Amino acid sequence: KETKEVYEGEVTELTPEDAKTISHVIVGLKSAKGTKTLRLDPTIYESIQREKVSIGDV
Amino acid sequence: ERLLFLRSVGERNEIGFPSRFKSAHYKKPTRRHKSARQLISDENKRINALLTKANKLVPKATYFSVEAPPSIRPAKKYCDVTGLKGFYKSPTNNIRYHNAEIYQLIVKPMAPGVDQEYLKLRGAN
Amino acid sequence: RKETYSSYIYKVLKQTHPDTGISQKSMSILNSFVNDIFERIATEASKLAAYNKKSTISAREIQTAVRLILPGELAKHAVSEGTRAVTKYSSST
Amino acid sequence: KASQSRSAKAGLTFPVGRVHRLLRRGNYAQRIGSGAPVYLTAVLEYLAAEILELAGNAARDNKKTRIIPRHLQLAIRNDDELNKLLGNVTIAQGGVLPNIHQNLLPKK
Amino acid sequence: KAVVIDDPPLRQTPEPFDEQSAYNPQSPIAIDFGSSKLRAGFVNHATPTHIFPNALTKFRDRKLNKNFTFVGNDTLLDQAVRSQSRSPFDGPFVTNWNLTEEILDYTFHHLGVVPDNGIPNPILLTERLATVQSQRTNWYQILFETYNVPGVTFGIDSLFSFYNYNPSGNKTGLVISCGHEDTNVIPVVDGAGILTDAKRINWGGHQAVDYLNDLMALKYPYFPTKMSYLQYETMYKDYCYVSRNYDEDIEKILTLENLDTNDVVVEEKERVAKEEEEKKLKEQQWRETDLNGWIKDKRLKLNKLIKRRKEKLKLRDEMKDRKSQVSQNRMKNLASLAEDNDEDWLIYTDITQNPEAFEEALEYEYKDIVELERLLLEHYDWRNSILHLFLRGPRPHDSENIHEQHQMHLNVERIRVPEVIFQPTMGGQDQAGICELSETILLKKFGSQPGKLSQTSIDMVNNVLITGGNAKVPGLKERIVKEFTGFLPTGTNITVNMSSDPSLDAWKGMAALARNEEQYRKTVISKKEYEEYGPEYIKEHKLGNTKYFE
């Protein structure tokens, strides 16, 4: 038995915070029904900069 | 009747020069015509004179502080002839067009001087 | 000391045809040609400015002189080149 | 503080300032505006470039590497707006385009 | 079925007078000096008594009387007196002032006012947001010396309508006013409009009608007649709406299944002769014997002739291009003919220019194609052309009839004209739209972060008000709701308000201010304040303007 949880939408805010090591990163997504602001650990941030994600990408 | 209806409705609502709705004294001054373009100009120069006196004091709510700033998002491009989505743009007169038939029939064999009037609508002349 | 346009038109030829030589008489014809064109355009503009009771020559009277003198498709290409040049030069901000 | 000429400000290879000089003391008008030499310089740019294009194609059409006045004459007289503009001017050492009337041929 | 438009009908009954017995010397008068219309009436009523356009004109007669009192609704009597009407407003401001005095005298005469040493009643007046100082001082001068009123109040009509729709005077909401010449977004906190963050877009109904006029004149440059401002105004009123999504409505507006519904239409020899007769008899016998085979052969011959004529027309079109490779080949052939035989003489003869002979050969080929079509009878469409769809809609067009030669189509303009208040770049104004101004008010201001709304922002979103005379366009509220749901965080409740008729809410606003509350006296300026503080005096109350500096 498993559970699938998915966030998708346009990036409107990408603000990492440190304490050379990022403490966390705050990402704000946006879709046609509204926005949502998420905190993220730096492990997902490394995968984000792997994908070359900037402001305005889906 | 037709010619005298206007006369009847004119003399019905006529007020002489000693108008009863004015004050006892009038003293009507002389004023310039003072078109709406130059009013912005001397209000701006009065604001700048007050600012350069006060410096050698931020404004709060003036006619130029209320005006909306330009957008941050990019503006969409539309065809100048039809108003549809403008994919292309002619290199000669800088007019955006939609497809090939508009370019062949309207944009390329167009009269001189009409391109500036087309660009007048979005302020690009 | 004498004046000629020769280096400029030489460069114009090297922009489109690098491997092409020049007769000096060809420069004499083409210098006379560009001077003659400048001659007719300038006095047409002066004549038009004297018509409109104006003492100033601007871009619009020479634009009208170009429309008067040149044939229609050359007129439209010439005013296209002139307008893009004067709008590029006017963007000194 | 040092800045270059107006010709590359307008992106042209012909001298804007020399044209301004000739328009000033050519006694055409008592006052000359700023944008007039730029427009005139651009017009002379396009005219000289088109004439050099037709001359270069004519010189390629004779398998030579130099511009002979024959090439200028055939390039001017072959093309028709240059025929209308330059109808009254005789090119020095130009020659005459080949034409025969149809009735003068040996029709048989 | 094309519908014809005309000028609006004129008023037959003249405007009436207020009774003299209803004059109260202490009751105030509410005046809305709008750019498009004037609304005047006594405070104690709920509906304004006089509605007329803010225009007037001078009339000349042969009897030399110079009667020039055709003011307001009097101009709606004849076509000649209406066309010469002139408003005191030039742009958003008032330039001339004698006509303002004449208009105020006309409305004071029609209000049933008998004065003495000036008007003995206080006056409720509106003004433009962040108006220039010269307008304020000159308004002070005319209203205090020319008419000598005891009290004067100034305010903004959007704030007056917001006070009308929440008369507690301390609510928090957002006001969007779509006026005649400008559009304003004014944020209100605790009943007081924060004028330091209000924004203005230089677009209104007048610019929309002029945009429609310029567009429609560009669409039909050879129109036979000339149409007035009022005709463009009424087809702006009747056939315009805001699309739910412009970026999807544009891509399908000119399709066939869309244009059929939402497109409106506004209004030796004898031997040769015997051989030819024998050939005609043989052709008649072949048609009587095998009609289908002869018809197929004639259709194939007509197709071959049409293909040859199309190739000839393509060659004739390609020969006109100077930069084409055929022109370069002709130049090379001319150079080779100059460089140099019966074959060379034939090539020099055939290399000659023959435009008239080309036209004669095209006529002969058309005659041959017509002969092949006649032999087939005896034995380019407008569906895929988007210019014809844009010009004449989904119906075929002929230019020889006068009925559809006076005919206009509105297909793209119905959503293009009201879209400029959302994208001002289309009108040439380098300003942000309504939705972006609302976004930067609610999200990046007033102590609110993107993704975290403060309590003031939530109270502002819950009380959005749309007012102004240009809210009559359908589809505005749904589009505003959709965009507001677009940029706000999820779960936020958005409530918008809209009058049944949003033109008259400012008059009800100052009526409810001067009547229901005695706190109208907080904003009242008297003689003594004008005399001791001068004309450059501003009362910082909750409904008017503020001091220019800090």
Side-chain angles (χ1 to χ4, degrees), chain A residues 1-19 23-58, chain B, chain C, chain D residues 1-50 52-75 77-108, chain E residues 1-65 67 69-267 273 293 335 338 355 357 361 380-550:
Chain A
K1 304 301 287 313
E2 286 267 6
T3 293
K4 193 158 169 89
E5 206 167 350
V6 156
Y7 304 105
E8 84 285 344
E10 189 197 299
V11 178
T12 63
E13 168 177 346
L14 196 46
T15 54
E17 285 92 7
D18 48 344
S23 98
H24 64 283
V25 54
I26 304 178
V27 195
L29 259 66
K30 187 163 91 45
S31 87
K33 322 283 304 184
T35 80
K36 170 137 294 161
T37 286
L38 316 150
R39 280 170 70 81
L40 284 183
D41 42 37
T43 298
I44 300 180
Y45 182 77
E46 187 263 356
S47 199
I48 279 178
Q49 59 197 1
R50 204 202 66 253
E51 287 274 339
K52 319 203 167 282
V53 170
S54 51
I55 292 309
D57 309 38
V58 178
Chain B
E1 171 64 40
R2 149 79 196 83
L3 201 39
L4 293 180
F5 194 31
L6 300 184
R7 318 294 197 277
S8 58
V9 85
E11 310 313 304
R12 184 50 198 84
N13 321 273
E14 198 268 345
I15 292 302
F17 198 94
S19 310
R20 58 190 192 190
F21 306 111
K22 302 298 205 325
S23 172
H25 95 84
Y26 202 42
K27 317 298 167 284
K28 175 183 76 172
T30 50
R31 273 98 42 97
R32 279 152 96 149
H33 267 289
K34 271 318 233 184
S35 57
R37 166 193 31 89
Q38 65 208 120
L39 275 161
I40 317 287
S41 81
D42 41 4
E43 165 73 276
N44 177 40
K45 88 149 61 50
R46 145 169 181 275
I47 278 296
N48 298 319
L50 258 191
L51 266 161
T52 197
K53 167 40 54 178
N55 197 7
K56 302 308 287 174
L57 170 46
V58 82
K60 176 159 131 192
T62 53
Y63 198 78
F64 326 106
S65 157
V66 162
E67 183 136 4
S71 169
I72 37 162
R73 271 187 259 93
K76 312 300 268 305
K77 288 158 198 207
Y78 297 113
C79 157
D80 288 275
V81 195
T82 74
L84 288 185
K85 185 188 203 320
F87 296 100
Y88 323 103
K89 164 166 102 152
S90 163
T92 68
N93 40 3
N94 302 275
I95 278 179
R96 300 171 196 157
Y97 57 96
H98 182 52
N99 60 333
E101 146 194 37
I102 295 303
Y103 176 74
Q104 283 282 72
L105 292 172
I106 291 331
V107 157
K108 196 168 77 53
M110 98 187 313
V114 201
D115 49 347
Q116 299 302 307
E117 145 48 24
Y118 268 124
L119 293 169
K120 257 193 76 39
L121 292 197
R122 50 172 166 120
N125 43 336
Chain C
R1 313 299 307 120
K2 64 212 171 313
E3 199 281 314
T4 166
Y5 292 61
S6 296
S7 41
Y8 314 119
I9 164 172
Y10 275 157
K11 284 202 251 183
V12 177
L13 179 53
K14 251 84 161 182
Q15 295 310 328
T16 165
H17 292 289
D19 42 354
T20 310
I22 283 284
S23 147
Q24 313 314 80
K25 294 322 310 163
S26 307
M27 227 50 41
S28 181
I29 319 163
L30 263 55
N31 235 1
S32 317
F33 160 73
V34 62
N35 287 300
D36 159 16
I37 288 304
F38 165 75
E39 161 46 70
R40 36 221 282 187
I41 288 180
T43 87
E44 191 46 10
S46 183
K47 158 69 199 82
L48 198 45
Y51 193 90
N52 261 15
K53 314 344 161 194
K54 238 177 154 188
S55 300
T56 316
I57 282 283
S58 74
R60 83 182 304 263
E61 319 78 338
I62 39 177
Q63 170 148 281
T64 322
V66 158
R67 294 201 141 120
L68 254 293
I69 288 304
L70 257 53
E73 85 313 358
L74 283 172
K76 99 191 261 196
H77 299 117
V79 300
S80 274
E81 211 66 40
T83 37
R84 64 151 311 300
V86 72
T87 39
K88 167 151 180 322
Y89 169 71
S90 195
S91 75
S92 70
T93 36
Chain D
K1 191 212 164 184
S3 45
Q4 57 94 20
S5 147
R6 338 186 218 163
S7 55
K9 299 263 187 316
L12 304 176
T13 88
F14 264 38
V16 163
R18 159 173 285 143
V19 153
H20 205 32
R21 197 248 318 272
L22 291 180
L23 259 194
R24 186 145 30 250
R25 64 181 80 111
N27 66 90
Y28 310 92
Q30 83 95 17
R31 173 175 266 103
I32 300 301
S34 267
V38 184
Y39 205 70
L40 190 39
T41 303
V43 167
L44 297 192
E45 210 66 0
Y46 174 99
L47 257 295
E50 201 57 5
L52 281 169
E53 217 36 45
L54 264 285
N57 274 357
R60 222 197 61 276
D61 247 14
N62 210 272
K63 339 307 154 282
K64 317 229 197 312
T65 65
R66 303 208 98 94
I67 306 293
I68 315 296
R70 161 66 54 162
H71 299 157
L72 301 171
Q73 177 76 288
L74 74 97
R77 294 291 161 300
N78 166 55
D79 173 357
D80 51 350
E81 61 284 9
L82 294 199
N83 265 313
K84 155 202 151 193
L85 272 169
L86 306 180
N88 81 305
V89 49
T90 88
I91 278 194
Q93 194 35 279
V96 158
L97 264 293
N99 70 345
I100 329 294
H101 195 198
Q102 303 345 320
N103 299 350
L104 261 306
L105 305 161
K107 180 243 182 171
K108 179 59 177 79
Chain E
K1 175 58 68 179
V3 53
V4 70
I5 66 167
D6 253 359
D7 288 25
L10 315 100
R11 204 182 306 274
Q12 300 319 105
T13 310
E15 79 301 329
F17 285 91
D18 287 309
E19 292 176 351
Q20 300 298 322
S21 51
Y23 193 19
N24 182 266
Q26 315 99 326
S27 180
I29 290 119
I31 292 182
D32 183 51
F33 209 76
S35 154
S36 158
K37 269 170 194 184
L38 203 145
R39 297 138 189 136
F42 267 123
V43 159
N44 71 94
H45 292 94
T47 293
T49 74
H50 283 286
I51 310 296
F52 43 85
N54 194 9
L56 88 161
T57 167
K58 327 286 267 197
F59 188 78
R60 176 55 59 198
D61 41 349
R62 35 87 167 172
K63 75 197 54 180
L64 199 43
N65 283 4
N67 43 299
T69 50
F70 286 81
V71 181
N73 214 311
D74 313 348
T75 78
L76 262 297
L77 263 301
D78 190 276
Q79 292 87 272
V81 69
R82 193 164 49 150
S83 317
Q84 312 195 65
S85 81
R86 157 162 63 251
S87 90
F89 272 94
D90 284 32
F93 300 133
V94 188
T95 43
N96 85 93
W97 289 94
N98 321 316
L99 303 174
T100 71
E101 301 205 2
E102 177 143 4
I103 281 162
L104 287 185
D105 280 359
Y106 162 77
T107 195
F108 275 151
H109 194 283
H110 265 264
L111 266 166
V113 167
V114 176
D116 38 357
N117 209 321
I119 302 304
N121 311 271
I123 280 290
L124 265 283
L125 195 45
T126 83
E127 69 169 4
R128 186 140 278 100
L129 152 71
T131 183
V132 293
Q133 170 73 288
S134 86
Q135 286 294 318
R136 176 192 313 280
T137 61
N138 190 25
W139 260 119
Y140 270 144
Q141 176 254 316
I142 180 182
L143 204 45
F144 264 123
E145 314 309 308
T146 323
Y147 289 145
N148 218 28
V149 288
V152 52
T153 47
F154 286 141
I156 322 184
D157 39 1
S158 43
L159 299 189
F160 273 128
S161 52
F162 188 74
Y163 182 78
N164 170 48
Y165 270 103
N166 49 89
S168 168
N170 55 341
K171 294 318 186 79
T172 296
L174 186 66
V175 189
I176 303 178
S177 162
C178 306
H180 193 73
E181 303 238 348
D182 60 330
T183 308
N184 318 317
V185 179
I186 299 177
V188 183
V189 167
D190 288 343
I194 309 298
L195 293 196
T196 85
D197 285 309
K199 296 298 182 194
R200 170 193 81 236
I201 304 174
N202 309 108
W203 195 264
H206 186 51
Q207 287 94 333
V209 173
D210 297 330
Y211 192 49
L212 176 61
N213 200 353
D214 291 2
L215 276 178
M216 272 326 307
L218 270 169
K219 205 173 147 153
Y220 297 90
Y222 308 129
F223 214 55
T225 169
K226 147 77 177 77
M227 271 177 328
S228 60
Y229 184 88
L230 303 176
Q231 299 171 268
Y232 283 95
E233 192 214 353
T234 178
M235 51 205 178
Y236 165 67
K237 273 187 205 343
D238 304 349
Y239 309 102
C240 270
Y241 68 102
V242 176
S243 71
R244 192 62 46 80
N245 201 352
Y246 195 70
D247 265 348
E248 322 187 53
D249 230 348
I250 274 297
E251 285 62 4
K252 64 190 74 178
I253 198 152
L254 283 197
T255 51
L256 258 288
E257 85 285 340
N258 204 296
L259 263 184
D260 36 22
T261 319
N262 57 89
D263 175 36
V264 300
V265 179
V266 183
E267 192 192 32
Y380 41 85
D381 61 321
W382 53 268
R383 309 304 210 284
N384 34 22
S385 80
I386 211 171
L387 186 49
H388 170 267
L389 283 174
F390 176 58
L391 254 292
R392 285 310 195 281
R395 295 307 156 82
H397 173 55
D398 58 313
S399 62
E400 68 267 4
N401 49 338
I402 210 75
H403 259 299
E404 82 182 42
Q405 215 180 349
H406 288 214
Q407 211 134 311
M408 304 192 23
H409 292 236
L410 321 179
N411 42 17
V412 200
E413 302 94 322
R414 318 226 296 148
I415 57 162
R416 196 185 167 172
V417 174
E419 209 67 29
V420 202
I421 61 179
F422 292 92
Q423 323 179 41
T425 316
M426 316 194 20
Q429 325 278 316
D430 212 27
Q431 284 158 337
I434 284 302
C435 300
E436 202 200 303
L437 285 173
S438 297
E439 192 262 324
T440 187
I441 279 177
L442 294 163
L443 280 180
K444 308 177 258 235
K445 216 162 292 294
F446 278 15
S448 289
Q449 301 324 290
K452 178 182 191 28
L453 279 189
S454 82
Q455 194 51 241
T456 317
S457 294
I458 293 159
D459 298 9
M460 256 179 180
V461 162
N462 209 266
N463 210 10
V464 176
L465 173 62
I466 302 161
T467 171
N470 213 37
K472 86 189 91 196
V473 168
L476 197 52
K477 171 202 167 161
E478 295 93 336
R479 169 88 182 249
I480 281 183
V481 152
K482 179 221 213 327
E483 298 265 12
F484 268 39
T485 326
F487 67 88
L488 277 177
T490 49
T492 323
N493 39 355
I494 305 141
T495 292
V496 283
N497 301 333
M498 164 93 101
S499 273
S500 52
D501 169 83
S503 323
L504 305 165
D505 40 11
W507 196 90
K508 310 173 161 51
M510 325 147 289
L513 182 59
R515 181 190 46 245
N516 170 237
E517 274 215 89
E518 212 44 59
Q519 305 321 295
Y520 153 70
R521 213 50 57 85
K522 189 189 305 299
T523 75
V524 160
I525 316 178
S526 42
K527 295 292 178 199
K528 262 75 54 182
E529 298 148 300
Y530 185 47
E531 277 133 9
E532 77 200 59
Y533 305 132
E536 41 268 15
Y537 172 57
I538 286 174
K539 276 194 73 106
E540 286 83 12
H541 62 285
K542 276 172 161 203
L543 277 196
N545 264 275
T546 37
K547 156 185 56 146
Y548 293 94
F549 285 92
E550 287 267 352

